[PDB]
Amino acid sequence: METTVLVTFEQRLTTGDVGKLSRLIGAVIPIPYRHHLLGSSQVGLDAVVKDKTRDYSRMRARMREMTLTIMRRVEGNQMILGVPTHGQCYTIRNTGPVSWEKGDVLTTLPPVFSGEVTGLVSVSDWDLVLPWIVPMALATEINQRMMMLALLSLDRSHEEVRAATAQLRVVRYRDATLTLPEITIDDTVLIDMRNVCISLSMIANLSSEVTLAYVRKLALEDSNMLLMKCQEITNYNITPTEELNKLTALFVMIRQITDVISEQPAFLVCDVSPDDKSALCIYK
C-alpha cells in the first residue's frame, strides 16, 4: 500500500510539546488505514483506548488488525511515520518499562492496563498512547494469565477467583510488574477457551499411552525437580508411523493452544543503546 506516512496534528503543539515529540519519534504507532496522509485522531489506537467497556480482548483484537509504523522527523507539526518495510533495521525508543532483554523478539503490548497514562501530551483531550514494546515471552505470559483468570471462573466460585487473581494478576518479573485489567469475563475469551477445551479433549486421545506413562515410569526410575511436581500433577504398541501422525496432530494442537495466548511476533532487535533507551530492530 504505502510506506511513508505524513501525519498532521490538527490540535495545538507548543515549545514543550515539540520538545516532547522527539522521544516519541523514537517510538511506534499502529495505523488504521496505511495512507500517506492520516488524521491524528486516527493515528494510534488511542481513539479506542477510551472504549468505555474497556476490554484487553478488543485492544488485542484491534492491534491484531492494525499495522505498526515508526515515528520520525519533528519538523513543524508533521510526523513521518515510516511504515517499516519487513526485514530492515530501525531505531526504536522505549516506553515499555523494561530493558527488553537484548537478543529477543520484542513485541506489541496493547494498552498497558496498569493505570491509564497519557503518552505524549493531553492537547484537545487527546494523548498519544502507543502500544508498549515488551518481549515475546512477556506478551505470551500477559495473555496466558488473561485466559487463566477467567478459566477459573467456569468451575470455581467467583470469590475464590477474585482471591486467586489477587495473587496471579500481578505479574512478577524484573521491572515488569503489571496488574491484569480486572479480567474480562467475555464471549471473546469464551470463543477461544472452548477451542482450548477442544484441543485438550483431543490431546486426551492424541496422547499415547507411552506419552502418558513417560513421567509415570520415569518417576519410578529416578528423580528430577520437574518430575516431583509431575508426580504431583504386551502393554504398548509398535506403530511408530501412526505415533508420528499422533505427534504431528499433537503439535498442531499445542501450537494452536499456544497461539491462543501467544500474540504476534514483532521487532527482532539488532542493537540496544547502552542506556537501554533505543533499539535497532528488524523483523516486524
Partner 1 sequence: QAITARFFVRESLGEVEQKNLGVLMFRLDTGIEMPSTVLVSLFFLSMVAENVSAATKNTLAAIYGREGEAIRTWLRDGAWRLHRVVHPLGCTNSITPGATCLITCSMRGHSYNMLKTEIYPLLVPKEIYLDLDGESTDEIRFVYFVITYDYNSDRQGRPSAFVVVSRITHRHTLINVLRYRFRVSRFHFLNNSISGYGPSTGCLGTLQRLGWFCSRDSRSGIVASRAGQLSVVKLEKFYVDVGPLVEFA
Partner 2 sequence: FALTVVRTDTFETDTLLYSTKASTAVIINTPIVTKEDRDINTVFHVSQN
Q: Within positions 180 to 239, which residues make up the interface with partner 1, using CB under 8 A?
A: 191-192, 195, 198-199, 201-202, 205-206, 208-209, 237, 239
CA dihedral of 214, 217, 218, 222, whole degrees rounded to 10: 180
Query: Coil, helix or strand for 268?
Result: strand
Site for its own copies in 13-32 (CB under 8 A): 32
Whole-number CA gyration radius for the chain: 23
Q: Which does 101 bind (CB under 5 to 8 A by kind): partner 2, its own copies, partner 1, none?
A: partner 1
- The full DSSP string for 150-169 is HHGGGTS-HHHHHHHHHHHT
Name the site residues for partner 2 (rule: CB under 8 A). Answer: 2-4, 6, 8, 36-37, 72-73, 76, 78, 80, 82
- Distance between CA atoms of residues 64 and 48, nearest Å: 14
x/- track of binding to its own copies for residues 43-82 (CB under 8 A): ----------------------x-----------------
If one asks whether residue 246 binds partner 1 (CB under 8 A), the answer comes out as yes
- Distance between CA atoms of residues 180 and 145, nearest Å: 8
Nearest one of 261, 264, 260, 259 to 106, comparing CA atoms? 264
Beta-carbon count within 10 A of 122 CB: 11
Site for partner 1 in 97-116 (CB under 8 A): 101-105
Among 99, 254, 277, 278, binds its own copies (CB under 8 A): 254
If one asks whether residue 283 binds partner 1 (CB under 8 A), the answer comes out as no
Specify the DSSP element, H or E, that contains 134: strand 132-135
Q: Quick one: 171 or 282, whose CB is closer to partner 2?
A: 282
CB of 15 to partner 2, least distance (A): 20
Q: Quick one: 71 or 206, whose CB is closer to partner 1?
A: 206
Task: Give the total of residues touching partner 1 (CB under 8 A).
Answer: 52
- Distance between CA atoms of residues 172 and 159, nearest Å: 23
Site for partner 1 in 44-83 (CB under 8 A): 61, 64-65, 67
Grid cell, residue 241, equals 508411523
Among 13, 48, 123, 282, binds its own copies (CB under 8 A): 282
CB of 82 to partner 1, least distance (A): 17
Grid cell, residue 184, equals 474480562
Site for its own copies in 219-238 (CB under 8 A): 221, 224, 226-227, 229-230, 233-238
Give the distance from CA 233 to its chain's centroid. Answer: 28
Residue 27's φ and ψ, nearest 5 degrees, are -85, -160
- Distance between CA atoms of residues 192 and 260, nearest Å: 7
Per-residue H/E/C for 59-100 = HHHHHHHCEEEECCCCECCEEEEECCCCCCCEEEECCCCCCC
If one asks whether residue 134 binds partner 1 (CB under 8 A), the answer comes out as no
Q: Quick one: 23 or 34, whose CB is closer to partner 1?
A: 34
- Distance between CA atoms of residues 225 and 227, nearest Å: 5
Site for its own copies in 162-221 (CB under 8 A): 163-165, 167-168, 191, 193-208, 210-218, 221
Q: Which does 78 bind (CB under 5 to 8 A by kind): partner 2, partner 1, its own copies, none?
A: partner 2
Q: Quick one: 4 or 207, whose CB is closer to partner 2?
A: 4
